[PDB]
Design a protein around this ligand. Structure first.
Ligand SMILES: CCC(CC)CN(C[C@@H](O)[C@H](Cc1ccccc1)NC(=O)O[C@H]1CO[C@H]2OCC[C@H]21)S(=O)(=O)c1ccc([C@@H](C)O)cc1
Lengths: 99, 99
């Protein structure tokens, strides 16, 4: 579909068998999701933006469905204020910016 | 144009007469630029990101050219890690996400 930017580009996703709302964010290299107890191996990481850094846990090869489009890639989990779908997954669903 | 997301959507902007590089950031409500000198009056403001809140200088009704498209809106200047073009200006140039 086509998503205008009058409001935040929030969409429903499915990850680890759970539905969530997430931001289609062209400004994020990789995907960051709210704290959640996913299974499997992870590695700790620090990610930075406006206001400084937060500590996250990096999971690899995580399956996320975005408006019916399936994607698989890296996901950082930590105390982010919003779920953020980054370019690593936006490319897999064929998402582009158009103007 | 149509912009794919396998690389950062960086563009050249023109503001205050000078050229700069900025990131098209659909996850940003607001446009925030690194420290610079801009003409006109400004007021203190706060903005929050992934890591917390920072103080910025809010310039209103600033003319800014984004890859040849003109916009006139609010520009925040402060300690952002990256120059980001937010939805307040992306809407002015007709940006949408498509997939
Ligand atoms: C300048 C920071 C960007 C460029 C370095 C990167 N960021 C994405 C950007 O879209 C954030 C997303 C966001 C949205 C709401 C609340 C917190 C964060 N938007 C944002 O800061 O916008 C501000 C201005 O406008 C206002 O509205 C929104 C909040 C205000 S990130 O989140 O920090 C981030 C950092 C590392 C990684 C690794 C994993 O790749 C992934 C994602």
């Amino acid at each position: 579909p086509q998503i205008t930017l009058w409001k935040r580009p929030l969409v429903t996703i499915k990850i680890g068998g759970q539905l969530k709302e997430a931001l289609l964010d062209t400004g994020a290299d990789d995907t960051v999701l709210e704290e959640m107890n996913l299974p499997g191996r992870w590695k700790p990481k620090m990610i930075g933006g406006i206001g400084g850094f937060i500590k996250v846990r990096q999971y690899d090869q995580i399956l996320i469905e975005i408006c019916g489009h399936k994607a698989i890639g890296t996901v950082l989990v930590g105390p982010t204020p919003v779920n953020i779908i980054g370019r690593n997954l936006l490319t897999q669903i064929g998402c582009t910016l158009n103007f």
